[PDB]
Amino acid sequence: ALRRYPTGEERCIACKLCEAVCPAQAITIEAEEREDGSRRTTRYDIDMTKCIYCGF
Amino acid sequence: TALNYHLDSPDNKPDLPWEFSEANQSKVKEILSYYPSNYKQSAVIPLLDLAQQQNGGWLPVSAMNAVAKVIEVAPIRVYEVATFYSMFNRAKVGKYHLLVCGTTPCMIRGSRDIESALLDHLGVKRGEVTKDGLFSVGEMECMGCCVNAPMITVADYSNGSEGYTYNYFEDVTPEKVVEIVEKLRKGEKPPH
Amino acid sequence: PYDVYDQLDFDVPVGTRGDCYDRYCIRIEEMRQSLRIIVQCLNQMPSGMIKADDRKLCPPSRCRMKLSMESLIHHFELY
Amino acid sequence: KRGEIGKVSGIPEEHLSRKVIIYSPARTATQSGSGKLGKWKINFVSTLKWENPLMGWTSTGDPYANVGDSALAFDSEEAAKSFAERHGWDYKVKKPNTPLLKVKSYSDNFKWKGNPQPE
Amino acid sequence: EKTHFGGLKDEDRIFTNLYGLHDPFLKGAMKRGDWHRTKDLVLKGTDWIVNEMKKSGLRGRGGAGFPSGLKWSFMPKVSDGRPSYLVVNADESEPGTCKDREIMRHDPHKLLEGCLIAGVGMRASAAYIYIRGEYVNERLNLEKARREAYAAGLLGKNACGSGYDFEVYIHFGAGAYICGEETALLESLEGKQGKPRLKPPFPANAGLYGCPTTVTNVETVAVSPTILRRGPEWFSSFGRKNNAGTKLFCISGHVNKPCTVEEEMSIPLKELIERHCGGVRGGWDNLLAIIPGGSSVPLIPKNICEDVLMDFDALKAVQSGLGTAAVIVMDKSTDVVDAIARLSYFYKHESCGQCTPCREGTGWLWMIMERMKVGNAKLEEIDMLQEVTKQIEGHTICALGDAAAWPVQGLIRHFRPELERRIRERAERELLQA
Amino acid sequence: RSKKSPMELISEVPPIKVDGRIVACEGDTNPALGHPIEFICLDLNEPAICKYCGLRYVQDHH
Amino acid sequence: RNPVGGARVHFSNPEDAIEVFVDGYAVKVPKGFTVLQACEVAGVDIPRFCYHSRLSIAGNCRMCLVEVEKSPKPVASCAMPALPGMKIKTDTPIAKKAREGVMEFLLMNHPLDCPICDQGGECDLQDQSMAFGSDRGRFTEMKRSVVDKNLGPLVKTVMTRCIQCTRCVRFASEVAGVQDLGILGRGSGEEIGTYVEKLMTSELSGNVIDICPVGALTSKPFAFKARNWELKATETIDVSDAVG
Amino acid sequence: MDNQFIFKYSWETLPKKWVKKMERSEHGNRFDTNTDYLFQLLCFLKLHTYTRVQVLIDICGVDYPSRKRRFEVVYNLLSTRYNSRIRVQTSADEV
């Protein structure tokens, strides 16, 4: 699950720190600068057929 | 509110022109005559202070560009010099800039009981010019052994570069500051 | 021996005929002795930290990565 | 090329006629460290990639898509050349560009301009 | 004598008219004895002047304490096309220092003659006096004295009618304490930011405008023309062997009548305070700590203020420094932690911010000192203070980092019980509150 | 209100008034459950945006 | 042993070549090299933040401090000239303690924004902090912050991450030739900027993105697009002009 | 029994022409020999009284493309009687 702040803003900052630790390469992230200038993801998809549910 | 960057305002903007004077060109020549002609940049401080005196105690961005043209350097060097030193006012100070709050040695003898009285007497915060435009408040650079801790520095920019005087007043009571400011308002200068 | 196995008391069951029945009796005894070792570990487990303090090799606490610069650098480099 | 090892290795004949580049990767411009230098790599020039029209993922049909970057590394140019020679790959060698240490001193920041010349 | 070091007769004083009781201009200068047979002193050769300075044993009066003659011997003896310069460092910005101002507002011609003599002794073609920017009136007085000297022929082309061509100029700063450092002053005088240079290029080989130059304090320059005239043997007969002479002291702080006075170089601190100035406020028992030589140098507690000699070497052996020789007496009626925290704030405010250890370390030291000013710190924080000070010392470009680290070390070295006491008292007022 | 994107939702939260020149944003009331500490300088005229939260902080008086 | 990065030392003459001991190893260098360069010849790679081989020397960061026998205090190897018979020491406790002191000072006001920094996997500050730095931070007080300024459509600026190495200023003054950038202010409050609102108009202005060791100066078009570890590097040439 | 004893004993008793590299450390006492003496060494180390190595734990290969002899074959050995482990390595190319 992807969480968001209580204000309604998504917490993901497109740091790609979860895509590099994923031992199964199940995460693919695409990011760019949003209209406000904030670092956010455009694409964040997880392969649950590759996921090993390790919690990394 | 000392900021290391300039926001364009009607009072100071690069578009406004700024030459020195007919009277101050001789001073500019004399200042530049003290250094080799290939090292004119060495006369940046005695030119910036002259611009500060002439303009009324503060340096607009136009004055810095004029000094850069006189010493023939990039204006960024003059900005670097003006921002580094603490005697160059980049905000707009009043006609008689008053320097109050002390330093290390003086507070042992009581230098931090002088600012608030004057601040509430003239009724505008530090770095804020009064409505009439006469007075301002700033932080001083204590010069000596400070035997008489309550000292105030009076920078005078009333007559420009011809009547600029930088005085230190020793042992001034939190009401004697009021007395000397009242004397300054009329025009008379107190003795030191 | 590795870890704290040399501080624990347990017997090593040994067979006599080598057949499938001995492999079963020993596979019973090794589990009774495992119960014994579990009891000893529960009784003698001390307090302290659970990871090596060389954070160049271990992750920082989630409260320390969100409050200290070097802890965040260590987290970023480790993950 | 005596690609006998290529024949007794198991690589398919189609992939044994590839053209590779033997080169030493240089130092990145965003870092001043020089740790990832001195190693030689074989570049298979694997560029045939496309986009998955279901999720936008990068698809490929080239087995040598990441081998030379992930596992196959050499300590010298001779080792990579011998490897390519034995595997029957047509190779070209790109000699690395190396920096030249010039004389630099802190006193050169402060140098006399010269006597004022009214030229 | 050697046993009794201290006490100068009025005749043996160098800085006459130190109180402003007489005309400081050219008339009084010639009647007092300035510019007296200066042509003879310049017509005796550069080598002779350096020899006399070396024999006199004049150590630097700017705080460093480096021998003046040996410093002047480092200037080039053969010109390779680069002119030699003399720079007088008159930018005194240390808190509690009043010496160079009193010198240049009461004895300007002593300074001018000293500049001429030092330029002759270092084969310099010009002299730049770098005055602190706040000294506007003193700058005008020095400029008037310069005009008088030029009008009388004492300076300029054929100075004193001797063939030496010396030009004296008056540059001034714009309110920066770091601009008093040797290389930062050269940066300021070159028209740039007053940020110190790295040392491997020494000023004697690459200084002002890339040319060889020497930076000297006003007191060292001002006493030069009278050492030659009176005699080095007379000058060397004051104070101990290695460090000898007469030095000005701006005594301030908690003393009955603070003043500026000239005394022998080896005057005992207790005798100095209790003889010229009044006794310590409330008596010598009320004494708690004395800053020996101004802000830069560390602190000295009462137990070792007894039988201490105000020397470059004696104060250094006590792990302090003579510095600018401006004592700041502090009584038991003052919080030392407050004072040391304020010194930390002053050094945070005056750091130019060029190198990493001083730019950040001074601020960190100030914050820790502010926290301990009210005891809002743990007992294990005092050791972190020592670690931070040791991390700052020795890694900075100039000596301002060392000067910003020494007061904290002096506080920890002689007043650790006070810090622990206030920390525990704060902790008790927290445990007994909730 | 799924029609509102997170950008439009974070663009509707009024800026927080801060008296000082600098504010520290952690992202949540409990520090351990938010984002890494972020110190924001309030020395401009426009509201200053947290680069993690998107929350805007503005100086109160001066 | 070989020089770091295969650096080629050009000896003009065999006569003008002093001898130094970097770690007890005999090293021959021309007169004019510094301690850092002599160590680079001897295979030892000294940490550096403000030193660039194409920029003038300015010993700001104090990170390249080494030990010299005839020195009471550590010397900046970037600016200290090499002398004949000089014995350098790099892996001694003095040089270490200096390096973890300097890293601790550098990582004191630095913002905790590595995840959102475009210099994430390619930062010299964190790479050297892992190697030559310490493990635990003793700083708990409030950090400083500065506002961000617009330098044009090419250079994205987040000046809170500035470590004040002045490499951008030196590049603009020496290599670019357009003096528009400088260090403004005094002390911990000193800032890099143009003072007035102007944009970097130099054709070589984008090179400040690379010389910056931290994420203070980053590319604006390539903002948040990808991380360095995701990128395959191809060594190609230019066709935009005839320089190649 | 121990790495300090096994190393010194095998230094003396073993024929010198077999082993050409002997590392003695805490990570493991290794013997590197030519491929034409491997069987001889392993038969000696299986029958000698003081080096009764009767268990072959595993045989692994390691690939070094930069070496002339590309593959490294490692023989991890165990002695139950003396409670010691010995590792023997050789090198071979693809043919």
Ligand SMILES: Cc1cc2nc3c(=O)[nH]c(=O)nc-3n(C[C@H](O)[C@H](O)[C@H](O)COP(=O)(O)O)c2cc1C
């Ligand atoms: C931060 C700092 C401030 C200094 N301020 C002064 C000063 O105001 N006056 C002075 O004579 N020396 C000052 N010095 C010492 C200078 O290095 C001085 O020019 C040098 O020691 C020569 O002194 P001398 O004339 O006694 O030989 C300062 C040094 C530092 C590091």
Ligand code: SF4
């Ligand atoms: S990219 Fe992954 S690790 Fe980074 S903020 Fe988003 S979910 Fe978290």
Ligand code: SF4
């Ligand atoms: S120690 Fe402080 S004043 Fe001296 S150069 Fe470094 S930052 Fe500047």
Ligand code: SF4
């Ligand atoms: S500049 Fe480096 S250390 Fe600083 S936030 Fe960016 S990646 Fe982290």
Ligand code: SF4
């Ligand atoms: S912006 Fe980058 S290159 Fe410029 S001084 Fe700051 S850290 Fe150095």
Ligand code: FES
């Ligand atoms: S503190 Fe201001 S003159 Fe003394």
Ligand code: FES
């Ligand atoms: S690299 Fe030498 S001090 Fe910065």
Ligand SMILES: [Zn+2]
């Ligand atoms: Zn936030």
